[PDB]
Design an enzyme around this catalytic site. Structure first.
Site, PDB file in Angstrom:
ATOM      1  N   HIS A   1      -0.483  37.147   9.327  1.00 22.63           N
ATOM      2  CA  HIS A   1       0.483  36.641   8.325  1.00 22.63           C
ATOM      3  C   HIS A   1       1.107  37.743   7.473  1.00 22.63           C
ATOM      4  O   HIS A   1       2.186  37.553   6.940  1.00 22.63           O
ATOM      5  CB  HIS A   1      -0.221  35.687   7.345  1.00 22.63           C
ATOM      6  CG  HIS A   1       0.687  35.059   6.323  1.00 22.63           C
ATOM      7  ND1 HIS A   1       1.714  34.200   6.664  1.00 22.63           N
ATOM      8  CD2 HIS A   1       0.718  35.158   4.969  1.00 22.63           C
ATOM      9  CE1 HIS A   1       2.330  33.792   5.566  1.00 22.63           C
ATOM     10  NE2 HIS A   1       1.748  34.358   4.524  1.00 22.63           N
TER      11      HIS A   1
ATOM     12  N   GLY B   1      -2.233  33.498  -2.455  1.00 21.77           N
ATOM     13  CA  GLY B   1      -2.891  34.817  -2.531  1.00 21.77           C
ATOM     14  C   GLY B   1      -4.274  34.904  -1.904  1.00 21.77           C
ATOM     15  O   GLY B   1      -4.876  35.990  -1.841  1.00 21.77           O
TER      16      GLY B   1
ATOM     17  N   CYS C   1      -5.126  34.197   1.266  1.00 20.56           N
ATOM     18  CA  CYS C   1      -5.161  34.553   2.685  1.00 20.56           C
ATOM     19  C   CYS C   1      -6.134  35.723   2.855  1.00 20.56           C
ATOM     20  O   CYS C   1      -6.118  36.659   2.076  1.00 20.56           O
ATOM     21  CB  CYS C   1      -3.786  34.962   3.191  1.00 20.56           C
ATOM     22  SG  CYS C   1      -2.574  33.606   3.247  1.00 20.56           S
TER      23      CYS C   1
HETATM   24  C1  LIG Z   1      -2.417  33.757   5.065  1.00 18.92           C
HETATM   25  O1  LIG Z   1      -3.123  34.425   5.824  1.00 18.92           O
HETATM   26  C2  LIG Z   1      -1.527  32.653   5.625  1.00 18.92           C
HETATM   27  C3  LIG Z   1      -1.559  32.363   6.997  1.00 18.92           C
HETATM   28  C4  LIG Z   1      -0.719  31.347   7.474  1.00 18.92           C
HETATM   29  C5  LIG Z   1       0.124  30.604   6.612  1.00 18.92           C
HETATM   30  N1  LIG Z   1       0.916  29.608   7.123  1.00 18.92           N
HETATM   31  C6  LIG Z   1       0.843  29.330   8.568  1.00 18.92           C
HETATM   32  C7  LIG Z   1       1.833  28.774   6.301  1.00 18.92           C
HETATM   33  C8  LIG Z   1       0.125  30.906   5.252  1.00 18.92           C
HETATM   34  C9  LIG Z   1      -0.688  31.933   4.753  1.00 18.92           C
END
Ligand SMILES: *C(=O)c1ccc(N(C)C)cc1
Ligand SMILES: *C(=O)c1ccc(N(C)C)cc1
Lengths: 306, 306
Positions: A41, A143, A145
């Site tokens: 991501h 934040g 992730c």
């Molecule tokens: C953070 O790692 C992360 C991963 C994927 C998404 N989406 C698929 C919206 C958002 C944040």
């Protein structure tokens, strides 16, 4: 005495958390030896997100596209590669705080501790069960992730979860440390939704055994059941089928309490049919399914309060 | 999204945990700078316990009566003193892992993280609320004496609880880091029992605000109440009186949600009288009182899901 959702002490994991930035996107990464792991991501912007081609996005990056910060120290990236939904960034410095560790893929119904992190900084810790439908009931803001899930066995940190995203119902999805999603989910903005969930029968049973070890028998009864007759009731109440493998797993807890598994099954069948009659079991007004047999053995006395 | 009992990351506290032994009694101690803190219980045997005179027990000890072990390293004791229900042992080595820290006495209704420890080794971490009746609903086995409670503010570890004993109903009692008990309890084997408890009204209200910030309004109503009329209902249901000080504390949460405190009070009054009608609030079937207003601000978004 007592019985609580108990996380593992998070210190060995805190020493591994770093911040990773690429362009304007920042998130958390996991620094073990000379590698930093994070969600792929990090190479996306909001506009990339509906239809990102990570292969195509990544080839446009260099090592110095990536900024990795462990506190006040910049770690220089000297190699990068993609593995499923994660990036592995090779860095110039080996983490002196690396604990003994393993990567494991957990199974549905199993539990782990989550170290919720923001900007590379740990903020909280709580226990999660992997639901049958492959989500966790976490607590995450923007934040988070790259926040990680783990269990600790003796010396050794078993890493099992890296957090990615939040689904429409507010539950959470992510991957193991090989970057493979738990569940059918994808790291894209789509209409994807968690599947119908079910109650984790083996855990509820483990937790009833916990209650007895801790001194409470109010819910037991004079009845027994067959595996088949139990499973007919299970189906009606959206509980997982009980299997002989699961009965076998309950062996030690059954032996410590002197209650046969299928007798505890009968007690559960009665609780499902009749309710709890305004009473509590281990402080709870509902039947709890977020503790495994291992979690019970971990936390309870090895001596039953008879 | 999500809402969980979240402990602070425990790493800064893990680096402070040691084992303390005197005769045949072993328990946990807390190593900060050149001092180790532990329950004075460590100088008792089972026979000392009904009627111990700690002054008389202690004067019979020397520095080398005490064995302090931080992992594989023995720390030599070079001074000892008693402060209320704890011992302060001065040691030859200053803990290089000492974090920035403070000792604070928490107030009833406040929360903290507990690092459950055995033989100087951290084993689990969970959040506790200090009950109005000065106990905590912990999870502790034999060997957990000296396990500590703490909050973390920026750099700084605020230590607030050292664990001592378990009461007849299975809840837990202990002291601040000056060794003064929370509650009327004493470190003796007596018939002492926890007093009648009450529900922490200010926390329930904070948690209703949490639910709204997270997107749920089902329990709100078109009514308001006076502080007085609310408190008459509170008394009937064994909830603490609401005070103007508490209403004032709820100011920020009220402002973020656009719901006046006394309007939320009316919603609570309705929930108390009518029940929850088979529904949940933040995943719970009951009204939860183990989160402070601060805990809600800490964990929730600063932006309401309107
Ligand atoms: C953070 O790692 C992360 C991963 C994927 C998404 N989406 C698929 C919206 C958002 C944040
Ligand atoms: C451990 O610190 C400790 C303290 C007091 C008691 N009792 C008063 C029974 C037991 C263990």
């Amino acid at each position: 005495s007592g019985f609580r959702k108990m996380a593992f002490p998070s210190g060995k994991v805190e020493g591994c958390m770093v911040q990773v930035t690429c362009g304007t996107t920042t998130l958390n990464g996991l620094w073990l030896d000379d590698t930093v792991y994070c969600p792929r991501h990090v190479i996306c912007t909001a506009e990339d997100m509906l239809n990102p081609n990570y292969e195509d996005l990544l080839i446009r990056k260099s090592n110095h596209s990536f900024l990795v910060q462990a506190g006040n120290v910049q770690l220089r990236v000297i190699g990068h590669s993609m593995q499923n939904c994660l990036l592995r960034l090779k860095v110039d410095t080996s983490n002196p705080k690396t604990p003994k560790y393993k990567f494991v893929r957990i199974q549905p119904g199993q539990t782990f501790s989550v170290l919720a992190c923001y900007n590379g900084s740990p903020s909280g810790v709580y226990q999660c069960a992997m639901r049958p439908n492959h989500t966790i009931k976490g607590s995450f803001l923007n934040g988070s992730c790259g926040s990680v899930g783990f269990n600790i066995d003796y010396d050794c940190v078993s890493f099992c979860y890296m957090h990615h995203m939040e689904l429409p119902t507010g539950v959470h999805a992510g991957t193991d440390l090989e970057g493979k999603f738990y569940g059918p989910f994808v790291d894209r903005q789509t209409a994807q939704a968690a599947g119908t969930d079910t109650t984790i029968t083996l855990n509820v049973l483990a937790w009833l055994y916990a209650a007895v070890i801790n001194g409470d028998r109010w819910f037991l009864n004079r009845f027994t059941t067959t595996l088949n007759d139990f499973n007919l009731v299970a189906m009606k109440y959206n509980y997982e089928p009980l299997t002989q493998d699961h009965v076998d797993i309950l062996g030690p807890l059954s032996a410590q309490t002197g209650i046969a598994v299928l007798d505890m099954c009968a007690a559960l069948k009665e609780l499902l049919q009749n309710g709890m009659n305004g009473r509590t079991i281990l402080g709870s007004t509902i039947l709890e399914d977020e503790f495994t047999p291992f979690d019970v053995v971990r936390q309870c006395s090895g001596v039953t309060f008879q």
